[PDB]
Amino acid sequence: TLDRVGVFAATHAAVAASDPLQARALVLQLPGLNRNKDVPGIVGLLREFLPVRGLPSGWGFVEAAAAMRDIGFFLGSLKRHGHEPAEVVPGLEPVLLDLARATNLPPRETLLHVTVWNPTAADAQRSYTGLPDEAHLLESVRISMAALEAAIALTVELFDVSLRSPEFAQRSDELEAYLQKMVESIVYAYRFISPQVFYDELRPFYEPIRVGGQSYLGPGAVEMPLFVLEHVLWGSQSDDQTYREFKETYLPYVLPAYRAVYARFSGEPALIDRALDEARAVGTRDEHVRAGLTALERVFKVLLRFRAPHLKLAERAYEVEIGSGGYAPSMLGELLTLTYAARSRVRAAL
Numbered sequence: 001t002l003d004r005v006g007v008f009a010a011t012h013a014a015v016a017a018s019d020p021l022q023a024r025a026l027v028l029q030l031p032g033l034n035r036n037k038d039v040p041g042i043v044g045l046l047r048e049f050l051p052v053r054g055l056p057s058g059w060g061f062v063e064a065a066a067a068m069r070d071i072g073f074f075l076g077s078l079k080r081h082g083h084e085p086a087e088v089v090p091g092l093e094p095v096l097l098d099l100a101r102a103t104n105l106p107p108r109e110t111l112l113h114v115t116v117w118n119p120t121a122a123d124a125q126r127s128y129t130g131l132p133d134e135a136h137l138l139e140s141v142r143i144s145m146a147a148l149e150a151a152i153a154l155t156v157e158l159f160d161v162s163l164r165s166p167e168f169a170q171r172s173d174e175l176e177a178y179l180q181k182m183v184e185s186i187v188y189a190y191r192f193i194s195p196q197v198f199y200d201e202l203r204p205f206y207e208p209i210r211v212g213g214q215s216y217l218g219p220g221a222v223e224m225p226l227f228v229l230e231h232v233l234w235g236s237q238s239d240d241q242t243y244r245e246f247k248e249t250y251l252p253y254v255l256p257a258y259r260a261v262y263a264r265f266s267g268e269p270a271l272i273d274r275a276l277d278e279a280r281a282v283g284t285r286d287e288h289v290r291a292g293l294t295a296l297e298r299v300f301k302v303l304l305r306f307r308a309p310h311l312k313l314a315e316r317a318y319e320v321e322i323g324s325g326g327y328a329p330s331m332l333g334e335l336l337t338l339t340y341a342a343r344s345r346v347r348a349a350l
């Protein structure tokens with residue numbers, strides 16, 4: 001049914017299959033060292049595979065992204081025990097900055113590195129803790145990432161489709177079906193991840209580190225390019241400064257292509273602004289306008305079926321401070337309000 005997912009999943013799998021530093025058996029030893037709080041051991045383990053003589057000249061994006069993944073788990077780990085990795089591992093920061101340059105991404109691990117670029121097998125999957133709850137946390141993102149990426153493409157495509165066309169309702173229906181994967185992610189997370197273990201055992205690994213004289217956030221599903229999708233769909237012309245600062249916070253952490261999608265649509269009417277202007281001009285007597293707006297309302301419905309339960313998941317974990325993305329759960333309440341207001345516009349048009 002979700003035929004667009006496969007190409008995105010295949011692009012991730014290429015990085016997941018890559019082990020340019022031959023580090024697989026080494027990174028598997030990291031969870032034991034974290035459990036023992038063995039900081040010298042963690043450093044010594046990293047230095048067994050950390051390149052010292054620069055990056056191999058044959059490397060492309062895939063090899064450099066894979067290398068950042070493997071070094072990356074050591075970054076959150078070191079910071080988790082109270083140490084700036086750049087300060088306790090000499091020669092590390094030049095390597096991180098070279099890998100940032102090679103990938104056009106930040107100089108540390110991101111969500112992409114620890115989830116979809118990370119192999120799934122028990123004898124290969126990299127992990128901070130090796131805990132079952134961390135395994136399910138990674139899985140919860142793998143459920144929806146490729147489907148979200150397809151949904152971004154569908155949103156960009158829908159932007160150029162007239163509400164007067166039967167194509168509008170059909171593309172919106174298709175978009176809704178990809179966005180349902182976000183809901184599936186949260187259901188999975190609510191069922192399989194203990195909030196207690198998350199807060200006590202996992203969360204400490206997601207603190208910011210300093211590289212290149214600035215601070216970079218640790219991995220979080222907050223880094224998924226959902227905010228780019230909604231920037232195009234409804235948010236691009238919002239004047240809420242807090243919402244704007246939220247989006248611009250994560251921009252460095254998403255694929256270059258999605259930064260470029262974000263830039264293309266900024267300061268310009270969002271999809272629903274255009275769609276509603278068109279509905280106003282043409283009238284809801286037009287059958288394709290009615291169907292298009294109805295299909296559009298269902299898109300907001302699924303966003304809200306993600307966002308509202310996700311808020312409860314987050315509050316439950318913090319019932320045991322701010323996330324890895326740097327916000328308290330109250331920001332989530334604000335984004336949720338914005339989403340209801342956007343759905344409200346669509347439904348008043350009907």
Ligand code: HEM
Pocket residue numbers: 140141144182185186189193195198220221222223224226227307310313314317318322323324325326327328329331332335
């Ligand atoms: C134990 C599990 C989780 C907790 C405790 C949690 C908590 C949070 C927190 C505190 C934020 C605010 C930003 C920050 O400071 O990090 C956030 C944002 C966000 N998270 Fe999660 N989260 C969890 C799982 C997930 C999952 C499984 C997904 C999707 C697969 C997800 C997707 C998002 C998105 C898209 C945002 C941006 C805000 C929004 O779009 O509503 N999170 N989360």
Ligand SMILES: N[C@@H](Cc1c[nH]c2c(Cl)cccc12)C(=O)O
Pocket residue numbers: 111114137138141203206219220221222322323324325
């Ligand atoms: N940003 C949220 C949840 C979170 C941190 N790391 C994550 C990862 Cl690696 C996957 C999914 C969610 C999270 C928090 O820091 O509590």
Ligand SMILES: [C-]#N
Pocket residue numbers: 220221222223323325
């Ligand atoms: C959720 N990060």
